[PDB]
Structures are given as structure tokens and as C-alpha cells.
């Protein structure tokens, strides 16, 4: 219970060490995949450096604010966002069975790109259910930006 609500840094450093050990095991087993583990220990190795922001008051308060924001509000946002994304991804794969929407993973990535301003609304391909696809994409975009707006405003009542 305390690990769930406290002592996160110990967990993160331990996970980094676990990735390093798996990298060693794969290295001596004659596998190329030891690189894939190693980079995950490398990237975490940099982010864990924020642990040392304590001992300086301003950076310590800043890091505490980051921690509490992630553990309080982003979880509530991401649950609803993932539900909406999965629902519309299944709808789009069902409507269009081929041509970049032949799998759930590809469709999920393509719809996620809209959330970060890298979407694709050209509609160049010759689909069977064109002009129904457009309505779904417009509705998805509007709902996603409503959710982002609600998150942003909800984080203003806490200040």
C-alpha cells in the first residue's frame, strides 16, 4: 500500500537495475535484442536524475508539483481518453477494413496523431464508406479537444 502511494524513487531505480540485468543476460545468450533492453535502462537513467532536485528548494517544489499532477489529474484524464480512443478506433476499423485501417494498432496510432496536431484529413484514398468516415473523424476531434479543455480548466481550480 505504501509503495502504491509512497516511495516511488526506489521502484524506479530498481526497475532500471532490472533492465540492466536483462540486458546482460541477453548479451551473453547470443541475442541482438539486448540493445532493446539497454536503451530502456539508459533513458530511465536520465529521468531518475530528477531525484536529485531535492536539496534545492525551488527545484524540489517544482518536482513535487510534477509528481502530484501526474498522480492526481493525469490518471483521471487518461482513463476517459483511452476509452474514447479505443471506441472510435474500433468504429473506424469496422467501417474501413483496409488501407492503413486494417488493424487496431495502426488505427489507434493514426487517431492518436490528431491529439498532438499531426493528423491527416486529406481523404485522398478511394474508400467505400467515404463521407461517413469524415463525420466520425470530425466528431472524434471535437470530443478530444473538449476533453483536453476540461482537463486544463480542472487544473486551474487546484491553483
Amino acid at each position: 500500500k505504501s509503495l502504491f502511494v509512497d516511495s516511488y524513487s526506489e521502484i524506479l531505480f530498481f526497475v532500471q537495475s532490472l533492465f540492466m540485468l536483462v540486458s546482460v543476460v541477453l548479451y551473453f545468450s547470443q541475442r541482438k535484442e539486448y540493445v532493446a533492453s539497454m536503451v530502456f535502462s539508459l533513458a530511465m537513467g536520465w529521468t531518475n536524475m530528477l531525484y536529485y532536485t531535492r536539496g534545492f528548494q525551488q527545484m524540489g517544489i517544482y518536482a513535487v508539483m510534477i509528481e502530484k499532477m501526474i498522480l492526481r489529474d493525469l490518471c483521471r484524464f487518461m482513463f476517459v481518453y483511452l476509452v474514447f480512443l479505443f471506441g472510435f478506433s474500433t468504429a473506424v476499423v469496422t467501417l474501413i477494413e483496409d488501407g492503413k485501417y486494417n488493424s487496431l494498432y495502426s488505427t489507434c496510432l493514426e487517431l492518436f496523431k490528431f491529439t498532438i496536431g499531426m493528423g491527416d484529413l486529406e481523404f485522398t484514398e478511394n474508400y467505400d464508406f467515404k463521407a461517413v468516415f469524415i463525420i466520425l473523424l470530425l466528431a472524434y476531434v471535437i470530443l478530444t479537444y473538449i476533453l483536453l479543455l476540461n482537463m486544463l480548466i480542472a487544473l486551474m481550480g487546484e491553483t
Partner: protein, 75 residues
């Protein structure tokens, strides 16, 4: 070094003979062969008919951008 058809690609190995095979986007993709470009057969929309609402235009035509588009000859 390379992956063959039916083998797992992108997890440390790329697929060879890329002029005939490709690695899909599936999070554990297996290398697959391309398919020939078969032209559009019947059960397509002809010129003047409504496209987009369940039927694509035949290979000789294009479907404009509209709420109720109709097939037309290429520009």
C-alpha cells in the same frame, strides 16, 4: 540477419527482398508478400451514380469531395 516470409520483423531483424515483401504495422509484425494491383471489377459505382455511401467509383472514375458525391471522369 534478415527475416523471411512468416518470420517476426522489426524486433532486431529487417525483412529482405523489399521489392516483394514488407513488414506490417502490428506491434509483433510478420513479414508479408505484396499483392498484385487487380483493377476494379463490378459492384462499383459508374459515372453519374452516388459514391462514398457504400460503393466506390470504378477504376476509370473519381469520387469528389462532397456530402453526396457522384463519380466523374479524371481531370
Amino acid at each position: 540477419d534478415c527475416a523471411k516470409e512468416g518470420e517476426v520483423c522489426s524486433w532486431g531483424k529487417k525483412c529482405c527482398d523489399l521489392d516483394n515483401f514488407y513488414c506490417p504495422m502490428e506491434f509483433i509484425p510478420h513479414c508479408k508478400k505484396y499483392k498484385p494491383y487487380v483493377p476494379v471489377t463490378t459492384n462499383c459505382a459508374k459515372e453519374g451514380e452516388v459514391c462514398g455511401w457504400g460503393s466506390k467509383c470504378c477504376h476509370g472514375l473519381d469520387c469528389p469531395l462532397a456530402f453526396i458525391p457522384y463519380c466523374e471522369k479524371y481531370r
